[PDB]
Symmetry: D2
Subunit: 243 residues, 4 copies
């Protein structure tokens, strides 16, 4: 228990993986959650270990409350402490509101909002003064500039409200709660080239997609002990999309 411990949900690839590595460099031991691809998770585990930190991968369905609880539980069993929770796992449904099914609605709520709520409750059994709760929201929580993202925008705006309320509750306990709001970020699964990306890019002021490091450095900034006076905050990292 000599190092701070960070749990990153969906930490096996993309933004999550980059956060895990950045926090490991900052001196956190690392737990990540993954739904299915054990090999991608073990790769992240190895890269964290190559930096001299301990890492563990926990299999968990972020869409289930049992999986939300088990992620915290297994992290605490592995390390004996919990210092930062980064709720990064999420999905992006896309389509006109009139075509959305009950299943899509339940899925996006369960993964993008309920998970964060349930994981936060469970984390607070273990977290102490100096703790950090960081939610990965979206710029689309503040602006929905094109059709097809009503469900996503709802869940991501929900995280802003949750963050404000939690920050208010935990202020005197010395735990902070903040939301990072990515714009379009290039990853394997979300490429920056092509006509669909061009449409999204046009709503950014920089006319570009960002990169995973743009988010990881902002999580690192918030997770620092020196960020003790930042709570309730939202940080847009979006190339000016919401401007």
């Amino acid at each position: 228990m000599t190092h701070r411990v960070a749990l990153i949900t969906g930490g096996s690839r993309g933004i999550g993986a980059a956060i895990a590595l950045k926090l490991a460099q900052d001196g956190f031991d690392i737990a990540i959650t993954y739904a299915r691809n054990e090999k991608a998770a073990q790769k992240v585990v190895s890269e964290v270990e190559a930096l001299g930190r301990k890492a563990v991968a926990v299999q968990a369905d972020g869409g289930s409350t049992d999986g939300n609880i088990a992620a915290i539980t297994k992290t605490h069993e592995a390390f004996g402490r919990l210092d930062a929770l980064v709720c990064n796992a999420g999905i992006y449904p896309y389509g006109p509101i009139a075509q959305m099914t009950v299943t899509q609605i339940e899925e996006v709520l369960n993964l993008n909002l309920r998970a964060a709520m349930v994981e936060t409750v469970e984390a607070l059994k273990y977290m102490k003064t100096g703790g950090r709760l960081i939610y990965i929201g979206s710029a689309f929580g503040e602006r929905a500039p094109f059709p097809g993202i009503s469900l996503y925008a709802a869940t991501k705006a929900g995280l802003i409200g949750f963050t404000k309320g939690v920050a208010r509750d935990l202020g005197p306990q010395g735990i902070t709660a903040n939301v990072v709001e990515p714009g379009p970020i290039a990853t394997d699964l979300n490429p920056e080239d092509g006509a669909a990306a061009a449409v999204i890019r046009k709503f950014t002021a920089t006319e570009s997609y960002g990169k995973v490091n743009d988010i990881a450095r902002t999580v690192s900034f918030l997770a620092s002990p020196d960020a003790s006076y930042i709570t309730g905050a939202s940080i847009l990292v979006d190339g000016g999309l919401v401007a």
Copy 2:
């Protein structure tokens, strides 16, 4: 049959919902209201709408189940043959520090305060046409959480802001508007304006007062008007200055 616009108000058997139902009826809407259990309160609202010259019906439905959300729309369309406004008013207010919340409270608030609006909206769009109105009852606490104990409620109510923005964007060219009304503390039977707890909440308002159900009903009426066609994606705080 079908000569008047029809409004469905969820949770319309008492408090804000009931007042919205009466105000819309006076504006010329036939009324459907949902209720979970108190049939007598629902029938009282039905009678008061009828006394104003409109048709009214009360539909029993659990807003916390998706089947109830679908049925509310289905039964309203069966009774009246059209749907012109949906007012998603039903909701619950859990209270307590976040570390004391249970899984069940979390599911219940999400199910009623957010999922219901989403599923009801999808179903309403099977029937709604140009000139339609989607009006969600959010809260001032969706924008400001000035004291501890309201994390879950704030989350769901902020969620409705984001949903409203996205839906407004989707439906703009179809001539259906989507807007959110954000009440501060409103006095009702269940939420009285007197007592030490209310004195604390009241101090966060600029007017140092609770509002009344008419404050919210009027605002719904303003948004539901056909003349409100250029208002969409909007939030209207009716909160005595709480969020200032």
Copy 3:
């Protein structure tokens, strides 16, 4: 002094004129300010008088503090009371920030923010419980979706902040302060035709410009004695532009 009195700045044409007529129908006696164009002001005065209300036109440069003070002073001399102030006068500079001159900066601050502030202070020498302060902001105070409007967006966001602070101050005195935020509204001066308008329109969800009645109705809704619980609020009337 039998009727409530509303002062509307810039009330001789466009949005201002439509507000003046709508409030006259609601039962307010009317004062309007005009910078130039006495004949347009006198037409508004006649239309208000045709409805049975008293009306006066006051010449005043909204960009000078002496004009800001005189507008209130002359209104109170003509009617003996003041019940609503609608700060509608303003300008819309357009262009890249690096090309803006000191003169354009001063002019927009003077007319779009300083005027509202000075007029509000003067109005509060006469206003009592039941009073109404209504500022005409802009949707661009909340979203600046294209280049060229940095100055305008600054002043119109400034009104939002002013509104919040004033609402807070005046709460216990029974005066409300609220901002109406128009999107693009078709008027004589802002036609609706042309490639520029086509670009703006595409940012709205309705893909249309609004009309003056959309704003007048909203002012009327706020100015009512039944709007006593609405204070600090912003109302977007923008066809979904800010969505």
Copy 4:
């Protein structure tokens, strides 16, 4: 011209001074503006020089457009380049809106909003891709929780709008514009003492004043070359006041 150059207005004391030292440590040569108090300014200069950087203090009235222009001009004359502008100078009027004079209104507008606008225009004559514009706003630009701060809230909300519009204009040029929003910060100029301070603390979720380093760290985070995808953003550093 081997190092990046940062100009910090009001950089002789409090938040400004802390920002100047932090950016010096990040590797910026430093220009600071001061109105009066040359000895405080010369102290900051000496501390920057002790770190191995070049520093200069420029006397300038931030409330005069000539002073706004001269700050940039003298900075460019000393160093031959400009890489970051931090608009930190400002004032905090306090009192009920009805008691505010025309002189107070002009003053707050001139120092808190016009200065930033004019300095930004002049800076863009020299700044290039990789440039940083960072405005020091306030949490009170988003929330005015008590009476007496209308004017200040207006100017600070104005900066948010200005930041959004500027970010939108400069996005494709590779210059970012962002606003930091301090809550109550204990400073040499704004001590954590008295009944007014006691009232302000109670609105924060942490029930505390912050410290200058809380702001300086955040400016440093935004001024980095790795912050390129952050633009149009506001970062609350306010102990949860706006929650």
